[PDB]
């Protein structure tokens, strides 16, 4: 969902 989507877009690195 959207709030989790947002933190992924902020923080995700492989």
């Amino acid at each position, epitope marked *: 969902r959207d709030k989790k989507q947002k*933190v992924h877009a902020l*923080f*995700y*690195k492989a």
Partner: antibody
Amino acid sequence: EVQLVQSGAEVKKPGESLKISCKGSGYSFTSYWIGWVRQMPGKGLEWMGIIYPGDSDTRYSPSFQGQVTISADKSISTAYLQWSSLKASDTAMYYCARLGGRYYYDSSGYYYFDYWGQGTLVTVSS
Amino acid sequence: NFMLTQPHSVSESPGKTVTISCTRSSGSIASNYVQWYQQRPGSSPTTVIYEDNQRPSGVPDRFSGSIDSSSNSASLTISGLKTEDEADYYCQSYDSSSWVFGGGTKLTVLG
């Protein structure tokens, strides 16, 4: 034994440059974001910015953007906060922290500050 | 874009179930994740709640967190207040994915 260990207290005058450090041990330094937080004396926490040591991807709070430099030296497992010209207003306690959690583009993923450095006291005065 | 507002002080005796509110001034509080930090006097801060309601492993079970969309506020609740809970508490969320902090709340355990 995950450890974020910040450098010693600093006493400085306006105009001087300063670089403080935050060293991570007990884990893979390049796999977790390191955040920087300011606390002026008697005041609340402020976010300064954050850096991923793997690629030196760096984000800044608008309040601090261009006022301070955040860098990292993956070979040394160290993150840094840097000024070229300190102001007496920069007197604060500085905290680094690791954004831990589970780094998966997933419903299962999450991110939060799970370890903090002990803080570095910067005192700027004439 | 928005301020996060907390009560300056809240004070209760131990045993109590006590809440700290965190009100967003513009935009739905439900739009971005809310974190809570505890900072004891002269100590570094620690995270007691993340993603609105998640409790980190070492944080005591008495800590929980929720959202109240009708007050546009988030809440940290301590069920069975203890003396070691005396601290400043800060809520935080995200603007342009820039982290916004609440002003902080001084929580006194009337001992």
